[PDB]
Amino acid sequence: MSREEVESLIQEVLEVYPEKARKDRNKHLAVNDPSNKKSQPGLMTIRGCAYAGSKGVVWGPIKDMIHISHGPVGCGQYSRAGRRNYYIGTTGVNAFVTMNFTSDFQEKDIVFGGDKKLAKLIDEVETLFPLNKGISVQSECPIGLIGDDIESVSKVKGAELSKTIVPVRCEGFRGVSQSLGHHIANDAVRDWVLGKRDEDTTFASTPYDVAIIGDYNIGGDAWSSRILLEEMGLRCVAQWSGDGSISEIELTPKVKLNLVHCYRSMNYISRHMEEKYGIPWMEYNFFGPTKTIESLRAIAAKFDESIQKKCEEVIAKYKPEWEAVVAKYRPRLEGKRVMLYIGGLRPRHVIGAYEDLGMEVVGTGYEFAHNDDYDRTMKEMGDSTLLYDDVTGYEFEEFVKRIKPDLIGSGIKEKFIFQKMGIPFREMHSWDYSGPYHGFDGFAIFARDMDMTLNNPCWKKLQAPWE
Amino acid sequence: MSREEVESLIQEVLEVYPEKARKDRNKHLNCIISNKKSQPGLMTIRGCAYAGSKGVVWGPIKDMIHISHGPVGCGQYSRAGRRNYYIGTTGVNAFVTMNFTSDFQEKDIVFGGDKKLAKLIDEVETLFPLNKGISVQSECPIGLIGDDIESVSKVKGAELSKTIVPVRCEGFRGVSQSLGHHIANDAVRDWVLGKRDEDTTFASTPYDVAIIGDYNIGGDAWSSRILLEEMGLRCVAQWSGDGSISEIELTPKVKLNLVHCYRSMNYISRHMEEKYGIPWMEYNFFGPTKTIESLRAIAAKFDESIQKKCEEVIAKYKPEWEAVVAKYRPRLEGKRVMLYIGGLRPRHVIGAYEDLGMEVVGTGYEFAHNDDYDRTMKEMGDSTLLYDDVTGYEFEEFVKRIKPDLIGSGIKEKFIFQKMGIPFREMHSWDYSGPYHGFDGFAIFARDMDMTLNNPCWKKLQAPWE
Amino acid sequence: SQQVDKIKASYPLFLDQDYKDMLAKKRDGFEEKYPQDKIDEVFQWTTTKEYQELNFQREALTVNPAKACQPLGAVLCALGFEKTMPYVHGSQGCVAYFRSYFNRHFREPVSCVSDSMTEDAAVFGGQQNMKDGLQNCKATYKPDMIAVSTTCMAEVIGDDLNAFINNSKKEGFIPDEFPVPFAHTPSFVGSHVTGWDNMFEGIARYFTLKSMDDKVVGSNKKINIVPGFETYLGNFRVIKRMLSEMGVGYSLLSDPEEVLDTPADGQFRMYAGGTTQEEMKDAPNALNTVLLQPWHLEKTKKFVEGTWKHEVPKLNIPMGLDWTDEFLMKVSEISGQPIPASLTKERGRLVDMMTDSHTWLHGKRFALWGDPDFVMGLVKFLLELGCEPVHILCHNGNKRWKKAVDAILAASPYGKNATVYIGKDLWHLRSLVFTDKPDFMIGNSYGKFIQRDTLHKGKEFEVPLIRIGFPIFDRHHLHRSTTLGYEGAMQILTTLVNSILERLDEETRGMQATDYNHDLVR
Amino acid sequence: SQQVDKIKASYPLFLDQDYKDMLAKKRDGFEEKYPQDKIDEVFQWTTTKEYQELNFQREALTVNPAKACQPLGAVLCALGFEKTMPYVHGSQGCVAYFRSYFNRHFREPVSCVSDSMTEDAAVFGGQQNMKDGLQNCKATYKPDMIAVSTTCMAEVIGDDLNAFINNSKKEGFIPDEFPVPFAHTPSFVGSHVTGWDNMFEGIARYFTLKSMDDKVVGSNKKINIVPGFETYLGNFRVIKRMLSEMGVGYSLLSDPEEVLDTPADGQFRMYAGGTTQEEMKDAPNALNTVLLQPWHLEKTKKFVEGTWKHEVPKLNIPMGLDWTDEFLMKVSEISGQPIPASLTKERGRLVDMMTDSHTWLHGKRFALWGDPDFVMGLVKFLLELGCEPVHILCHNGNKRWKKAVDAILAASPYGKNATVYIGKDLWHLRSLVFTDKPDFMIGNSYGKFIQRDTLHKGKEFEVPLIRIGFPIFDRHHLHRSTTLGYEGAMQILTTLVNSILERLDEETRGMQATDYNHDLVR
Ligand code: ICS
Ligand code: ICS
Ligand code: CLF
Ligand code: CLF
Ligand SMILES: [Fe+3]
Ligand SMILES: [Fe+3]
């Protein structure tokens, strides 16, 4: 499939739209040559809201704090357990990630405000959950619309109880997607948590302290990243929102380097720690052997000879392991074509792992990326591959019908559509209840999963022998 | 249900039969005859001599391997059918729930299975080293084809210093499970019981007893034993219920044999008396009244010490069984039961029912002899119904007229009467509940009769639009 | 490390000694974790009656709820109509969540749009959103009907749906005749079930209200059946099956059976089956309307009685023996169709299963939860089985309902140890299953975390979950089951007795320890 | 001791201290038990490859067989005919056993009689028994037909069934025209499946061998269906349901489904439903005859082809996707009926469930057993699911069968690690699940003792049993399930995925240990 074939496909698809939608969507579909706008109403965007980005993504994973889905019951219920941010803890005692704490707004709270209810709740949280190490209040749509002052309540109650209480104004009507949620969340960490130990000289820093910024530990992804950096002699003082603690966050200003995986969700805070604490940051990729190897090497290069050399040891150690996974899966997956649609990082970052298995990504796209994400993406995709920002359900269905990829990698709302069309589908958010996919150990699982689905005997059994 | 009424029912039911059958069945319906052949084609509830020997007497003996010798059916249908409970590591040192079989194919029928039995004895010995003995339970073909399982047992047994018991309990022998018991009693007597006749090593005490004919159905022997030892006695053996070979060999040293199941065990008891002077007595551990009566009778046989302790035990459980009657009796008061079980239970549970104020309006046995019916007429009410080797047709017709509130019989009867709307309890397997023996057994027995008879489901058999 | 022939996923990869060490170091080094002995102490404390009293005094904090919000039900109601697009006017985050939540439970596509109201609509209203939204949806997804619902954003700013829809028609965004029924579905009033009711009532009003002048109650000779919020495909199919067996003409309003179960045959079908617009228009001509789940269909009842003039029968949800009997007899009455031989047999086969299984079921103690109708039916059935529904919890239940259920309980010896809880949640229930330990829970997937908590206290305190309800996300295809009718009663019975027997097999699977009672036959 | 409010049955009564003490004393004095350390040592020995090799060298000893004897299958065959009494000529012990075995599996009455041959008959034959037997049975239980089989006593002494029945007719004990088909059914040949085959063919012969002159292959335009030894009600049911929705005229020869499921309505029905004598007589006029379980219907095949002149289609048991497709298309061909839209969709739904559940099922390893047709169908379906049928045991399988299955395995990368065992038993299988541990067993209730053994070696060695087959005694109402067709495939698929997911939930229920992977959504 060629250049003006992709261009004519785009026009073909856009023909169905009313003119306004047409003109807009046209700007959001491109063909590659090596964003951040509102969704058009009624077109079945796959996007979520600012609450998803703040509660679901950034704060939710923080293990030992209680997060309050503040507003009506919906938001917190549908997101409860929704995401696979893994963690070690005693849930309901010292850790709370999979629980749904909510202020469960009823009409009296809408009509007269929930700030009073929130103060009551904070006390209730305190009596019933004495081992919590902090609270966050994730505002749902009504909180801002209603004119509550969660900040006042947070300061007052925080003062009274000597707790870190973070107000987060991540109401779903703000921004255009879960992206602004990340930014609001980053700012809330900044304003209410990150400064707490500014005056603590007490932490015994070493020249090798790093923090994993933007790894939410999906299926243990952060754990299989950590092990590698640790083996290379670095100390990870903190994992940002993936099995994360509040103390780890408060300690993050002591480190020597911020290692950013998820640029999109956490570049904001990285920039800030740079300005304020002088801490430099760097982007890395831990999807597949190739990327993991160059990342380990770029990170090692930031330190002194001992680390450069532990790096080389680590790389040598895993060589036989990753080299075996390919010899076993490579022959089963080479030349297959993958279409991706994911959120703000993985649509670009998951290309190298595919290529290590001889696969090609013929189309990719993001829900909520900005243009700096697309600048990064174009480097990674082939000429004439399809790019789609905030794809509509319709557009996606149509692109798939033309391109006929062998495998699609996207979310839970896309899964069952393509499976019914007979295209092997892997969930590229929840790692389809499998994973981790990060690091060398994650590559083995990734390889095995792409293979089991794409080469599954079920895909031959769609059409009945009589039609 | 009056007596002229009962006799009228009896005659009416019999009138379906051809004459030959009618004249025989009339003889078997408070007199009565028992232990005769079943009339062909009439759907007897009885089993065979193999069931009586392997199923009932031998099977429970946990540390021996019991070979169902013949084709594959018998062993298979009897695998763990009976809830004879044991403590042990099954497949290593205990083997009760396993099915061992010589699985006869045509070649073994045409040429005989004696060489295959010799080969499998070797294989048992290879794969199950910790076994303490082997028994060989013959199925129908073994005798018919003229095999000599005795020579195989004697030869191989001598060759391996191992007790190998040949049992001629082929299903064609006798008329029921009953002869199976006897064949099995004689097989113990001839190949096991005498083994320690020259042994002076066992320190007997004046309080050694043995439980004879408690097969530990749902733990029944365990809930019996406890009470006897809490009365001061030492139970050296339990016959066939969590029973082990050494126990059986030690039984010659006891002071007294406590016979629970008279039918199945009287044979070996009488023998122990003749050969060893060991006296035997019958008892009942079903319900508070009987257990009380029994504990006392068994104690009065020894002295004072055992008699004080007997009275201690009685007081020690009086709160418990009285709580049980208080709870359950008002729920079961004046309810009427019809029973049908094997050769003991059809009389022995009567008292236990009466302790909950229920009336047994009918009872009968599969394979009892006249001595059992002698015993049975004392326990049954005036003008109640007796039936020996009841036919399917008869039992159905009796229940339709008698309309009992509860029926207590076996697995082949269960689902018939449940569809008729009558509460049914299995009084062989205890419907996977029990124990029913002793005072702890009484508690469960009481809960079970109530739960079933007063179950909400029985109100629901008729559709409201009908 | 991985061994390429035995690749390990998260479990049990992280159990490898190197991972174990790394995690221990992470903790000790940076997490400032409470000492384990403190954690244990707090855990034991959270199992006490003292924690419980305090847990039960909560007024502002809800922890682990057993309900979701209005538009979720409105969407489910809408999918039940022929070639209809559910449309929620408000913020888009809601639609992503509604679609994902049902996607997880049904394993299928769940189609639904938003009109993406942002910051700016919060000030000036969402009129332009409705105008472009409707047009765009109609053009792109080609539904015959658009069923409009609302998110809390659009509720708080008080958008007049009616005006906006009329203005969209008026400005020519969508043609005048195009069906756009609507409902206001505020997340801060009642729950998901309310949204179903509101939506259905909106749709019924839309096709019927201004047409009543020619409707003769009875002339089509059918009974309408309104299923309510229903997430078991079987329940839908069992109803129609039974009515077809009786030869009863019916008109199930809101069928989402087809579209929640399309075949995987090489094509994705966005719409499938459903109640036709013609069925909804003709629905006043029916002999009567039966509400399968009347405790969350109050608004629909008022409308059907008040406007259609149907004497809605006083029927409970057709769950269990008695209530399935009542359902059938009422249908018989209304339609003059005799209850056929097949249903009589089927009922007796259920009764037969009851007789066979009663000894294991007798006196078993249950904690349970769900929507009000579902819960009361399960309560009823448990009593019929001779079981004890000891903790009955319905977060979204109301006072009158609670009264109705306490009445049901008072009418049976098996209700004596039972308490109904309304407005309470799964953290509340957690206390109750520690302090007054039942044998099993009957609930939705959220229950697993309760079972996990009980196990932590010890094996003897573990309360196993029996997954019946919504949502069920950690098992596959149970959404295909049936809980209504004799069929559903058969399934529930089987699932109860077998959960009991399997647990017993687990407890008696100790070699030489407990396996004396590890019976082959039960 | 007992608490009147909390009465303990055997479990856990005997865990009480005073019983624990009492059992300890009983052992140590009198039992002369091998010491525990030796017991443990022998147990570990029995799990080894060393033990396995000796175990597999057995020529004479069978331990824990996975078959029953012929007359059992004859009885089941016989119960499938209208108002027929099964009658086993020979000794009564057998009949008590046959009835009990089925009573336990079906939880229903099972009616069958014996003639009660004793020692006396061993010397002089069983003629008088047959004479008085038939007469007595006929008068007492009033069947329309008496279907005679044999026990091994009667076989060994060589009673001529034909002559005996003829002499009972001659001598006036039963009417000349009373239907008394027979079959010799030796327990020492084949197994229960063989008994079904012999009985069916006896009944087929009885009704057709003389009448053949007026028979026109095809004239009644039906297809005959012979089910074989079948113990799932859903299987008889699904075959009828599919053929009916396809509009195919058919004649299910020998159907027991009514008499094995008779409502509890205040009556006991000895007889219910079943294949009519008129259908057996009209059966040669069918277009063709389809054998649902061909590997144990050899004699029946020979007769149907040799005497009725039907070209019996070469179809496998309709288990799994491909074999259900092949079945429907062959039926379409013969009947001239198209496969309706409803069946086409049901198959699609089945494939849908496969696509949704494939990631959990992929590469899962199973040990399995049962009858030859059942086992191969289940092998077939496992392969289609992407699962590996590692240990395939069929005690009553033959060499040709083992070849057929090895060919099925050979055609799939999923069959690469699989071995089929014929003439082997469950104590053989117990070694295989130790030395080459699979994830699950698919088997009948005898499998529980293997699970118990694996558990005893350690939790990580436990192989859970998934109960599919016959007999299932320790769960309730599984006899009502389906294993054939798309429906049966859907059920098996759901049971497998869910057994996998229950097991993982057990393994990840450890607070702060394994719970990291105790996901809400799977
Ligand atoms: S945070 Fe972001 S959508 Fe960077 S909101 Fe989303 S666990 Fe995606 S592409 Mo779900 S920017 Fe993380 C993401 Fe990427 S939830 Fe996960 S998979 S790497
Ligand atoms: S042995 Fe007998 S049939 Fe005495 S063969 Fe039978 S476990 Fe019955 S009435 Mo089943 S003479 Fe025991 C008996 Fe009674 S198996 Fe059990 S219940 S007390
Ligand atoms: S964007 Fe929660 S789901 Fe909504 S309707 Fe009122 S309760 Fe229900 Fe984002 S923040 Fe939440 S998810 Fe929406 S509400 Fe806004
Ligand atoms: S009375 Fe056995 S079941 Fe029969 S037919 Fe050959 S195998 Fe089968 Fe008693 S002993 Fe056994 S049970 Fe009978 S056969 Fe005789
Ligand atoms: Fe699906
Ligand atoms: Fe039944």
What is the architecture of the domain spanning C364-469? 3-Layer(aba) Sandwich (3.40)
d(CA D114, CA D134): 10
> If contacts are CB pairs under 8 Å, which of residues 458-477 in chain C contact chain D?
473-477
Residue D223, classed as helix, strand or coil, is strand
Q: C324 by DSSP, 3-state: which?
A: helix
- Return d(Cα A229, Cα D385) in angstroms, integer: 39
Task: From B263, B262, B225, select the one nearest B241 (Cα to Cα).
Answer: B225
D320-363+484-522: CATH topology is Nitrogenase Molybdenum-iron Protein, subunit B; domain 4 (1.20.89)
Tell me the technique behind this structure: X-ray
Q: What are phi and psi of D253, to 5 degrees?
A: -70, 125
* Residues with CB in 5 Å of ion ligand 6: C 352, 356; D 107-108
Same domain, A225 and A298: yes
Burial of A383 (0-12, 13-18, 19+ CB in 10 A): exposed
Does C352 contact chain B (CB < 8 Å)? yes
Do residues B88 and B130 both lie within one domain? yes
Known catalytic membership, residue A52: yes
The reported resolution of this PDB entry, expressed in Å, is 2.1
SS3 A394: helix
**What is the token pair recorded at C238?**
């069992």
Of C291, C222, C227, the residue nearest C256 (C-alpha): C227
Same domain assignment for residues A225 and A259: yes
Which residue type, as a one-letter code, is found at position A56?
G
Q: What is the CATH number of domain D215-319?
A: 3.40.50.1980
**CA–CA distance, B245 with D423 (Å, rounded to integer):** 33
Helices (H), C66-147: 70-79, 92-106, 121-124, 127-141
> Do residues A161 and A39 both lie within one domain?
no
Of the residues B171, B191, B211, which one is the last residue of a structural domain?
B191
Give the HSE-up count for residue D100: Cα atoms under 13 Å, Cβ half-sphere.
27
- State whether B153 and B264 are in the same domain: no
* Ligand 1 and A349: CB distance under 6 A: no
Give one DSSP letter per residue of B292-336, joined into a string.
Answer: HHHHHHHHTTT-SHHHHHHHHHHHHHHHHHHHHHHHHHHHHTT-E
- Locate B12 and state its tokens: 């009416």
Specify whether the CB–CB gap between B220 and B435 falls below 8 A.
Answer: yes
Q: How many domains does chain B have?
A: 3
Whole-number Å distance between alpha carbons of A125 and D225: 67
- For B148-165, the three-class secondary structure string (H helix, E strand, C coil) is CHHHHHHHHHHHHCCCEE
Of B37, B40, B141, the CB nearest to D156: B141
Same domain, B220 and B291: yes
Helix and strand totals (H; E) in chain D: 21, 12
Neighbours of D52 (CB within 10 A): 18
HEC secondary structure over D156-185 = HCCCCHHHHHHHHHHCCCCCCCCCCCECCC
By alpha-carbon position, which residue is closest to atom 4 of ligand 1? A262
Judged by DSSP in three states, D389 sits in strand
Which CATH class name applies to C69-214? alpha beta
Residues A34 and A63 in one domain: no
Given a contact cutoff of 8 angstroms between Cβ atoms, the answer to whether A148 and A168 are in contact is no
- How far apart are the C-alpha atoms of B396 and D323, rounded to whole Å? 46
Assess whether the C-beta atom of C231 lies below 6 angstroms from ligand 3. Answer: no
Range of the domain at A236: 193-307
CB contact under 8 A, D100 and B38: no
Given an 8 Å threshold on Cβ–Cβ distance, is C511 in contact with D452? yes
Parse chain D into domains and list their residue ranges: 69-214, 215-319, 320-363+484-522, 364-469
Least Cα distance to B135 among B204, B217, B192, B213 occurs for B192
Sheet holding A281-283, edge to edge: A235-239, A209-213, A257-260, A281-283
- What does the alpha-carbon distance between residue A61 and residue A136 come to, in Å, rounded to a whole number? 12
Two structure tokens written together for B68? 């169902």
A382: left (phi over 0), alpha (psi -120 to 50) or beta: beta
Task: Give the C-alpha separation, D457 to D434, whole Å.
Answer: 9
Question: Catalytic residue numbers of B?
Answer: 48, 51, 82, 181
B39 lies in some domain: yes
State whether the Cα torsion D214-D216-D220-D222 is positive or negative. Answer: positive
Q: Which of A25, A28, A70, A83 is catalytic?
A: A83
Does A313 fall in a domain? Answer: no
Burial track C334-343 (b if 16+ CB lie within 10 A, e otherwise): bbebebeeeb
Nearest CA in chain D to C522: D474
Q: Taken in order C260, C264, C270, C275, is the CA torsion positive or negative?
A: negative
> Same domain for B435 and B337?
yes
What are φ and ψ of residue D164, in 5° steps? -60, -45
Residues forming beta bridges with residue A366, ordered by sequence position: A342, A389
Query: Phi then psi for B276, rounded to 5 degrees?
Result: -120, 5
Say if residue B221 is in the same domain as residue B235. Answer: yes
Q: Are residue A301 and residue A336 in the same domain, yes or no?
A: no
Assess whether the region C69-214 and the region C320-363+484-522 belong to the same CATH fold: no
Contact A465 D325 (CB under 8 A): yes
**Ligand 2 pocket: which residues have CB below 6 Å?**
B 52, 56, 82, 177, 215, 217, 261, 263-264, 341-345, 428
Q: What is the Cα–Cα distance from D264 to D261, expressed in whole angstroms?
A: 9
Nearest to D235 by CA among D341, D327, D355, D352: D327
In a domain, B132, yes or no: yes
CA angle C513, C517, C519 (to 5 degrees): 130
Q: What CATH code is carried by the domain that includes residue A231?
A: 3.40.50.1980
For residues B35 and B55, state if they share a domain: no
Three-state SS at C219: coil
Rounded Cα distance, A417 and B454, in Å? 54
- Residue A213 Cβ inside 6 Å of ligand 1? The answer reads no
Say whether both B62 and B134 belong to one domain. yes
Contacts of B246 in chain D (CB under 8 A): 30-32
Q: Is A81 a catalytic residue?
A: no
**Closest Cβ–Cβ partner in C352, C412, C516 for B86:** C516
**Does the beta carbon of D93 lie under 8 angstroms from any beta carbon of chain B?**
yes
Q: Of B306, B322, B344, which residue sits at a domain end?
A: B306
Output the DSSP codes for A88-154.
Answer: -S-BTTTB-TT--EE----HHHHHH-SHHHHHHHHHHHHHH-TT---EEEEE-THHHHTT--HHHHH
3-state secondary structure D265-321: CCCCCCCCCCECHHHHHHHHHCCEEEECCHHHCHHHHHHHHHCCCCCCCCCCCCCHH
Which residue's CA is the closest to the ligand 2 atom numbered 7?
Answer: B215
Distance D89 CA to ligand 4 centre (A): 12
Long-range contacts from D299-303, C-beta under 8 angstroms, 24+ separation: D299/D197, D299/D198, D299/D201, D300/D197, D300/D200, D300/D201, D300/D204, D300/D226, D303/D201, D303/D204, D303/D205
Give a yes or no: residue A312 inside a domain: no
Q: Which of A168, A192, A216 is the last residue of a domain?
A: A192
Beta bridge pairs of residue A67: A136
Q: How far is the CA of B131 from the centre of ligand 4 (A)?
A: 26
How far is the centre of ligand 6, averaged over its atoms, from the C-alpha of D475 (Å)? 13
Backbone φ/ψ region at C411: left (φ over 0), alpha (ψ -120 to 50), beta: alpha
